[PDB]
Ligand SMILES: NC(=[NH2+])NCCC[C@H](N)C(=O)O
């Protein structure tokens with residue numbers, strides 16, 4: 001009889017889940033050993049004070065110090081920061097020593113400078129009131145870090161985070177590592193690692209978020225009134241509804257979608273300025289509108305394109321500045337009218353009351369090019385003209401949630417920004 | 433009788449072309465007045481020492497100092513630099529004073545710092561052996577600047593360069609400015625401004641480029657032998673042929689495309705290492721290949737995606753790191769094999785001899801996901817499976833022209849980089 005020592009750093013939930021599963025499947029005596037730092041773990045392995053460790057990114061240098069299994073799983077990787085910053089917002093970043101993260105951040109953000117640390121306390125003091133703007137580290141730090149009032153941004157869908165593997169003192173547990181490898185790749189264990197870990201970390205992040213709601217002292221018994229824009233403009237029970245509602249679920253607030261008939265002349269934004277509703281989306285955050293409501297961070301980025309009569313002047317123009325003498329149709333007070341007024345200063349635009357009228361103008365040769373957002377233009381075709389691929393997307397703008405300009409909305413909007421971050425927006429967008 | 437004074441700065445070819453055209457059409461006595469600086473021109477206008485000026489970007493502040501016509505034309509705008517740098521490569525940039533360029537560069541590249549100058553000599557000394565890395569200025573500077581051995585990058589398809597207009601002392605030539613405006617927008621004059629100016633500046637840039645060929649001292653009587661990759665891999669008489677051939681035209685070298693049958697086992701790269709041909713494209717600049725040939729700058733950026741059996745495991749995985757236990761098929765020694773070996777370290781990939789065999793493996797359920805480049809995958813469908821939109825483009829890589837590793841190729845490759853810059857690649861790509 002014996003005992004296999006497997007290394008752990010901080011809250012090593014994947015090492016626990018994986019090796020409990022293995023311990024039990026092969027009837028193995030596992031013994032977890034806490035190491036105060038990830039690089040402590042690495043020395044333990046090549047040395048031999050520990051038999052196994054997980055979550056180690058394989059490298060060519062590394063395979064010459066101790067022996068690797070093939071990658072067994074992903075590793076959730078976060079930017080920890082007071083406020084929830086992004087990578088391209090930092091000039092200092094804390095970096096766990098010995099990790100693959102040194103190379104990753106200099107390869108993708110070489111200007112930031114890294115400051116090395118050892119373990120959670122060191123990381124925590126660097127952040128906890130220090131010079132470091134943010135720390136990049138694994139799921140091991142999530143639970144203790146969010147306790148200390150920190151926020152995260154999941155980096156795995158932001159950067160190519162390499163898969164991860166189980167490792168062993170070189171030439172040591174060769175046969176056992178093989179069996180462990182083959183078991184880990186099984187349909188069962190893989191399905192278990194995907195879901196339980198995702199569930200595990202999303203729950204910690206929800207709890208932190210929900211504690212913020214409570215700390216905000218807003219009345220969660222209040223039914224938030226929501227309106228969705230249904231005047232042909234930019235987007236919509238689709239992308240916007242899912243983001244708003246699921247964010248409302250993220251925060252354990254109750255939201256109710258409300259409608260009448262409206263709107264083409266009965267603006268919902270008026271309802272928002274009335275304070276007769278609390279939330280309105282989508283809203284494309286113009287300049288005109290920027291001050292009349294509070295805004296969540298963006299959650300979609302529409303592609304402005306030009307719609308032209310088919311077969312008309314193809315490849316004559318390669319970008320919209322060369323339309324100096326073409327007739328461009330926009331809708332009055334619409335965001336695209338503003339856009340062109342910046343982009344093509346002092347130029348005559350032709351204004352219309354509606355998309356319908358805007359389109360019919362193009363068809364009647366009243367006008368030659370009209371401004372639409374791509375996704376909306378594809379929609380119209382499904383339910384005789386086309387896009388000028390040459391010019392193509394001449395602009396990318398922002399869609400956000402708007403909140404009524406009062407104290408409640410001031411508190412809601414930053415909260416909704418976080419709920420949106422934690423969402424899988426890409427999936428929703430695809431769906432539609 | 434009288435005389436209208438219209439302002440000019442340096443080689444103001446658009447002011448000449450436009451106002452000659454107007455002078456003649458309305459029977460007007462024009463008198464050009466050289467101003468040593470663009471901001472000299474502006475003061476002349478609001479003052480009244482000059483009756484007209486062109487190429488002035490309209491602004492809200494500006495319209496309160498002198499009066500604007502509506503935009504009449506675009507303005508070719510260049511980064512001037514020793515070597516031909518790009519904006520995101522500079523920490524210092526020279527900026528003409530009074531221009532719209534101050535605002536444009538800080539809005540798109542705030543980190544660079546601007547250093548103001550007055551006129552071509554000032555600009556030229558800043559560049560000519562100075563601290564400035566590069567100057568951003570209009571077509572006015574093109575001919576004198578390229579004389580002084582400078583290179584350009586056309587910024588108009590790089591940045592939103594606002595259209596441009598004719599301007600006048602405030603409340604002065606009101607009626608005449610109207611007639612001038614309406615004439616300029618005419619089908620005729622517009623067509624004249626598009627083509628003659630484009631022709632004019634492309635010729636100056638060709639001449640500079642061709643002088644470089646001559647200065648290189650390479651034998652332009654030599655017929656360069658070119659091969660195009662025709663083993664299913666990344667791209668191809670299409671994108672690559674147009675870029676290579678038209679670049680060959682750009683440089684007044686003679687290139688001849690050569691083929692046999694080959695190649696799936698008879699690599700053209702071997703022909704390149706043989707020195708039996710001079711040029712090979714496309715070639716996706718791996719690491720494996722990076723040192724065996726000289727490479728032009730990239731001219732296309734393929735989208736690596738995963739091809740999967742239809743209806744199989746949709747939305748189970750959102751990026752390729754989560755394929756740790758899926759069977760991925762690549763071609764042996766292919767670029768994608770290398771890619772995955774970086775991206776999914778120490779993981780078993782299944783290797784094949786060909787695309788054909790790779791595909792049939794996916795169909796035979798030998799394998800579950802295979803790596804293709806998007807454009808190539810669309811091709812196959814046209815002449816039962818699909819892409820995993822969820823993962824989507826998990827990588828963007830580079831396509832370049834490769835040149836044989838000898839002195840001639842060492843000279844050709846940098847030259848071909850310039851010829852490619854001056855090309856309209858977007859148009860070619862579209863076409864295909
Ligand atoms: N205890 C940890 N998982 N620390 C982070 C490790 C990061 C990365 N997987 C590496 O081995 O370089």
Ligand SMILES: NC(=[NH2+])NCCC[C@H](N)C(=O)O
Pocket residue numbers: 441470486487488489490507528530531532533569570572596
């Ligand atoms: N002579 C010139 N065109 N100088 C550049 C002017 C740049 C820009 N059109 C402006 O008026 O601000």
